[PDB]
Design a protein around this ligand. Structure first.
Ligand SMILES: CC(=O)N[C@@H]1[C@@H](O)[C@H](O[C@H]2O[C@H](CO)[C@H](O)[C@H](O[C@]3(C(=O)O)C[C@H](O)[C@@H](NC(C)=O)[C@H]([C@H](O)[C@H](O)CO)O3)[C@H]2O)[C@@H](COS(=O)(=O)O)O[C@H]1O
Ligand SMILES: CC(=O)N[C@@H]1[C@@H](O)[C@H](O[C@H]2O[C@H](CO)[C@H](O)[C@H](O[C@]3(C(=O)O)C[C@H](O)[C@@H](NC(C)=O)[C@H]([C@H](O)[C@H](O)CO)O3)[C@H]2O)[C@@H](COS(=O)(=O)O)O[C@H]1O
Ligand SMILES: CC(=O)N[C@@H]1[C@@H](O)[C@H](O[C@H]2O[C@H](CO)[C@H](O)[C@H](O[C@]3(C(=O)O)C[C@H](O)[C@@H](NC(C)=O)[C@H]([C@H](O)[C@H](O)CO)O3)[C@H]2O)[C@@H](COS(=O)(=O)O)O[C@H]1O
Ligand SMILES: *[C@@H]1O[C@H](CO)[C@@H](O)[C@H](O)[C@H]1NC(C)=O
Ligand SMILES: *[C@@H]1O[C@H](CO)[C@@H](O)[C@H](O)[C@H]1NC(C)=O
Ligand SMILES: *[C@@H]1O[C@H](CO)[C@@H](O)[C@H](O)[C@H]1NC(C)=O
Ligand SMILES: *[C@@H]1O[C@H](CO)[C@@H](O)[C@H](O)[C@H]1NC(C)=O
Ligand SMILES: *[C@@H]1O[C@H](CO)[C@@H](O)[C@H](O)[C@H]1NC(C)=O
Ligand SMILES: *[C@@H]1O[C@H](CO)[C@@H](O)[C@H](O)[C@H]1NC(C)=O
Ligand SMILES: *[C@H]1O[C@H](CO)[C@@H](O)[C@H](O)[C@H]1NC(C)=O
Ligand SMILES: *[C@H]1O[C@H](CO)[C@@H](O)[C@H](O)[C@H]1NC(C)=O
Ligand SMILES: *[C@H]1O[C@H](CO)[C@@H](O)[C@H](O)[C@H]1NC(C)=O
Lengths: 321, 163, 321, 163, 163, 321
């Protein structure tokens, strides 16, 4: 008669690595790395992403006429912008401190748009022929919907002096711009006054823009340029404009109703009409794994990103042949 | 393994023992059979569970990338920002992969240790009342019935009775 | 007769954690994490911190009249500035490259103040009515003590042309500014000349400032703005000023006598009249522990900061029940 | 423990042994008593001291935060700077906490190892001149006086004399 | 060491054994000599090789500094950039130095383990047919010629023949 | 008769450290840290470094007359610039976005220089007396070879209007500058026109430079200043200049033929005429070690840098005394 001591074996093939030996077959193991995703862009905790499709952040915010979908947008979980969206600045130009503004959008979940300068209100100047063929809408030459390209009326551009008091108990994103004409002849043609300026002031802001003239390559059929500036106007503070030419006035200014966790995700992908609690640029994640290896930039309740192809822990013991 | 039991002096495992990790197999006149050692098995289950949770929780707080945008004349700080984000991923990737590697090895030797300690536990009870065969087995001098076998698994092997 | 082998046990309750088991009672352990501080801001190696109290770095350096305490300051170990000090820029404005200057102060232990432009020396211009109600001292309207707000004398602002040669064998922090008036009427009222400038030159510096006019919100009772600039004037180099209006001249310039390890600590706390060799924003540290968990930003001979609540090493062995 | 001695076949420690970590307890006609094994104890004291100093020194050079200020339109590099400082704290926090965790486990098994090696050292001297009881104790066939006991602690147990 | 064999109950190594890491030394009427145990030695060689390659490969991807230039009024981001590059060097320096430290200790105990397991392997074959001297040696009751010695190294020690 | 079990010992003295014990002698060990270098700057994979010697990147690129060696440079593996090269900007000035340009050079292996504006072509203006004593060549007063310092002809500076179309299928580094004179008298002396400008435009660039006048310290015998600007002109895009004074025209513009891994190494060292596959500022590396401790900034197939003095792995076992 005898009694032996021994240990478990089974039909498992799962292997794990150690420092001294690799591909060690074990009886039990636990994968801790999530390797899969659904391949779609998706609602996060129910809340839909703002998918700009082919519009850019600038295109949306300036109200490019191709970005009609994104007038009065509902609140979003996160934002999706392509790498090189075609519908950016229709009229050639620059967006001043664009990246610093995009950064602000990571802290923002919802804008509510409001009018501060009525388009009609420009009684002394002409407001309805401030268009270009670079921004076409339904065949006709149009312009950024949120700003007014002011021109002279019966050959006179009198000084503009406008003030807006923020009486909303919110911060307010104000946008405006300046036009940089091609030659001294076009300067006089549009605004008459040979030397012009735009002075914008707030409690903090103390700015004075002047148009710079230069011969430039035709981008989108135009050698003229627009340079757009912005500020956050704090509540109970007034912004003051004064200009004798080349001024792009604000019609609408976005109001910042909700501030939360958001992000500007970069993805060529569209919309799966799916829901998740962890999103990536390549797709969405649904797992209990502590790790994943899909893509570093995620949003929501996510496992930790690593570059590993494999993370498997031995739980059981060396399995015999 | 470090402790010499698993794939060592005990050459192989038992497909026939399904109700535990470590245990005994007896053979006498009345029959044979596998019995899992609950205590050593439950200890192994706890030790590994904690190990896995300990590992998960230690990696719980780790670097998270955020997207940041830089224009055409901010190339230096774009590049700084890339190397910073990449740099941390390599570190946290190395940590995870190494920890797994190191603790896997410790996990297998842990199992090896537990078998060996269970074998010695039995060896110490039997003393010179059985032959140490050298393969994990002890061959009794006295006839050992199923209570005598249970007596060994019990921890209650009555040495003075069978000497 | 018998002999046994065994091990130590005792009345210890100290526990430690391991990978596989937590709260393991041991006979001996060693805490390596320092968890406590005195809660005070303190002298470092004897040397006192420059505690600005409610003044800011700008307020101190420009000589804001509320920052009278900090005229001719002694050398400091480190500096303490509040989060939002009330006595910053009394007259609304901006400090140009303020953060880059504050950074320089981390390399600085002592300034010695010296006069380079005598206030009297302004014989051609008027220097004694360069004040505002935004900076009051003892009831009367005053101004930044280290700079001179120059105005016209009997309705004439002639061109200023001043040069200072640094013959001290030190670097020299020079400060100056420009005034940005409200309207063209106030420009002429103060300086007469409609278009003005300030040209400042050194071996490196080649600057020309112009006043920008704009309608601005009244901050501290004033819609006017001051924009302050600075340079380090290297020894044996001269700085040259030239201006026909809107100029804020340097009276005093700080001299950089000592350069050492310092830091601008941010703390609402005041002064305990205590001494230490490791200081934090929340208090001071006196321990031999290799670690602490008080606050990341420290100064002096300190243990290493970690976010842990507990770091205890087993020295002894598993203690029996 | 890995080595099966502490809280293993030796079920518990000795409150009565205060002058060392590991040692012997004898009981014969003339009395009983605890004697610490100096050599194994001093080795354990050195090993752990070095361990602690090794740990301190390895953490000695580690990331130190510095305060930096950024204005309202430098938000990206403010945020970059925060994630960089935070990122390193998490790394150095993980390192410290993990090292402690891993080396604590090694420290306890080290102690377990030392007891076991001391038990085997004794076992090897006595050989078949005493009964291996299975609880850490060896029961002698010959009467063993206090010199005979010292002989065992000595390392000088004269086997040929008592066989 | 943890396993008590190297510099333990086997007090010292053998300058005379050059063809392996672990092995046997016999002495009988016909002569004496060293014979390396190939199996245990080749296992040790593989385990350490893998260990070294595993270590090299894990450090293979690690932070690489790049030169970046900043002017006189970019001092903050110059300093940020320095602390970032330095910060990663300290981390990767700590990793390398610690890993070496930890795995060196494991390597020496690995060797200690292998000797001990080889000693036990032999001990289990001989059983009570030889005296366990306590120094790594087994003294036979029967005369043991060079085939009898090879029989032990073989793994083929015929116990029933010599009992 | 007896048989023993034992282990190897030998005449080795190699030691290794462990957590619990240091200077442990072992039978076998493996050093993994490379501690040595040849001490020379060297060809990388055959390809020679661009060693500027005492010239700077600016000096080379603007064609400083002391940097004659570096006209039409061959392709390089990497670049070597001293800490403080003496031959930088001969005529005092600033290089605009210099660091951002130097960064671009890390992505560049070869420039091919080409002429876009012929020096002769300046028929309306004078081009051959655009020199200064600050940049001497062979005793005579000279200037940056790649740019033309234009001056008035028979007391008239008519408006310049020049356009260059990039028809090479490459990016093109264009360089130009502006002169900042000492006083209003020298402005008229050189260019006559009291108020001048330079407008430079591309598809993206929209710039208008004006000369700033100030009294400045004589650097290299001159109180005047030059401020150099640059752009990358993309293929099939035209750059347009227009100026009525103070203009430094491009003669030559560097063409970017090859883009690869490069770096601007900083080293006082010269050239060993040696070849390597891993280079550092202090020397070159030839080893199979996975680590080294020479210098963090390397280029090529290199081991990993660590700050360690010693990394030795035990391979064998504890060696007996
Ligand atoms: C080869 C040739 O000689 N072509 C002439 C054309 O250049 C010229 O019209 C075109 O060029 C002009 C100025 O050079 C304009 O850019 C014009 O485009 C528009 C535009 O859609 O963007 C027309 C808009 O009505 C106008 N809008 C406003 C508010 O001013 C803008 C604007 O002036 C510029 O964009 C500002 O920089 O320009 C484009 O069609 C045609 C017709 O001349 S016309 O435009 O004066 O009617 O004549 C050709 O001979
Ligand atoms: C409702 C109304 O119309 N109120 C009038 C007041 O606005 C006006 O004085 C006030 O406004 C003026 C200019 O609009 C000044 O800001 C003035 O304040 C001071 C100041 O203390 O800061 C007065 C100082 O003496 C003056 N100092 C210098 C060196 O110039 C400064 C300075 O001009 C500005 O700050 C530069 O931008 O301003 C403030 O009291 C009063 C009286 O007018 S008075 O100032 O000409 O005497 O009349 C009200 O009707
Ligand atoms: C003590 C005193 O008054 N000395 C007089 C000298 O100052 C003066 O010549 C010197 O000063 C002038 C202007 O103040 C110039 O800087 C001149 O140097 C040059 C130079 O080599 O850099 C001469 C060059 O030919 C000239 N080149 C061009 C293209 O203009 C440049 C250039 O004007 C400046 O660099 C632009 O700021 O300057 C230097 O020799 C002498 C002679 O005067 S002269 O230059 O009119 O002939 O007289 C001294 O008494
Ligand atoms: C281990 O197995 C993997 C996956 O089956 C295989 O790709 C690899 O070549 C193996 N490596 C070693 C060292 O056995
Ligand atoms: C408008 O803004 C001013 C400051 O410009 C503030 O004092 C005032 O309370 C605001 N609202 C109204 C209704 O006046
Ligand atoms: C360990 O003890 C601590 C405090 O004494 C307690 O907070 C914690 O819940 C315990 N953890 C476990 C796993 O028992
Ligand atoms: C003043 O500075 C000049 C340069 O501007 C220098 O050459 C001179 O030596 C300095 N001191 C005196 C006393 O001239
Ligand atoms: C170990 O050896 C090194 C080099 O020989 C020596 O400098 C050092 O003092 C020694 N350290 C210890 C702790 O023995
Ligand atoms: C020159 O550049 C223009 C745009 O400026 C481009 O359209 C054209 O194709 C180029 N080449 C020629 C030969 O016209
Ligand atoms: C174990 O089993 C035996 C019979 O085999 C029984 O008599 C005894 O009571 C049991 N003891 C324990 C401790 O379970
Ligand atoms: C140890 O003790 C015995 C007496 O018990 C004594 O005779 C012997 O010489 C001692 N040996 C050593 C090494 O201490
Ligand atoms: C080993 O050696 C013995 C005699 O020394 C021989 O008879 C036997 O065949 C051998 N067996 C093996 C497995 O090598």
């Amino acid at each position: 008669d005898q009694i032996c001591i021994g240990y478990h074996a089974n039909n498992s093939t799962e292997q794990v690595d150690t420092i001294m030996e690799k591909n060690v077959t074990v009886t039990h193991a636990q994968d801790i790395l999530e390797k899969t995703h659904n391949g779609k862009l998706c609602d996060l905790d129910g809340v839909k992403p703002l998918i700009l499709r082919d519009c850019s952040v600038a295109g949306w915010l300036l109200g490019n006429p191709m970005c009609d979908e994104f007038i009065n947008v509902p609140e979003w979980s996160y934002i999706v912008e392509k790498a090189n969206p075609v519908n950016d600045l229709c009229y050639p130009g620059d967006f001043n401190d664009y990246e610093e503004l995009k950064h602000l959008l990571s802290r923002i979940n919802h804008f509510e748009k409001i009018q501060i300068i009525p388009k009609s209100s420009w009684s002394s100047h002409e407001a309805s022929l401030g268009v270009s063929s670079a921004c076409p809408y339904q065949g006709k030459s149009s312009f950024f919907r949120n700003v007014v390209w002011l021109i002279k009326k019966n050959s006179t551009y009198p000084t503009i002096k406008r003030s807006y008091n923020n009486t909303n108990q919110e911060d307010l994103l104000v946008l405006w711009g300046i036009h940089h004409p091609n030659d001294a002849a076009e300067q006089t043609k549009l605004y008459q006054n040979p030397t012009t300026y735009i002075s914008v002031g707030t409690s903090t802001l103390n700015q004075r823009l002047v148009p710079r003239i230069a011969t430039r390559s035709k981008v989108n059929g135009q050698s003229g340029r627009m340079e757009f500036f912005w500020t956050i106007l704090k509540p109970n503070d007034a912004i003051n404009f004064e200009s004798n030419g080349n001024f792009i006035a604000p019609e609408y200014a976005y109001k910042i109703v909700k501030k939360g966790d958001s992000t500007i995700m970069k993805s060529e992908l569209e919309y799966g009409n799916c829901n998740t609690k962890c999103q990536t640029p390549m797709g969405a994640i649904n797992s209990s794994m502590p790790f994943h290896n899909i893509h570093p930039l995620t949003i929501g309740e996510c496992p930790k990103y690593v570059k590993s192809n494999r993370l498997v822990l031995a739980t059981g013991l060396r399995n015999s042949p | 393994g470090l402790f010499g039991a698993i794939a060592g002096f005990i050459e192989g495992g038992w497909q026939g023992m399904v109700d535990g990790w470590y245990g005994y197999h007896h053979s006498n006149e009345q029959g044979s059979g596998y019995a899992a050692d609950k205590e050593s098995t439950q200890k192994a289950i706890d030790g590994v569970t904690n190990k896995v949770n300990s590992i998960i929780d230690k990696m719980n707080t780790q670097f998270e990338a955020v997207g940041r945008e830089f224009n055409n004349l901010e190339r230096r700080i774009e590049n700084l920002n890339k190397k910073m984000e990449d740099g941390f991923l390599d570190v946290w990737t190395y940590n995870a992969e190494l920890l797994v590697l190191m603790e896997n090895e410790r996990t297998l030797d842990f199992h090896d240790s537990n078998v060996k300690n269970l074998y010695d536990k039995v060896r110490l009870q039997l003393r010179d009342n059985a032959k140490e065969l050298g393969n994990g087995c002890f061959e009794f001098y006295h006839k050992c019935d199923n209570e005598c076998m249970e007596s060994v698994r019990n921890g209650t092997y009555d040495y003075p009775q069978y000497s």
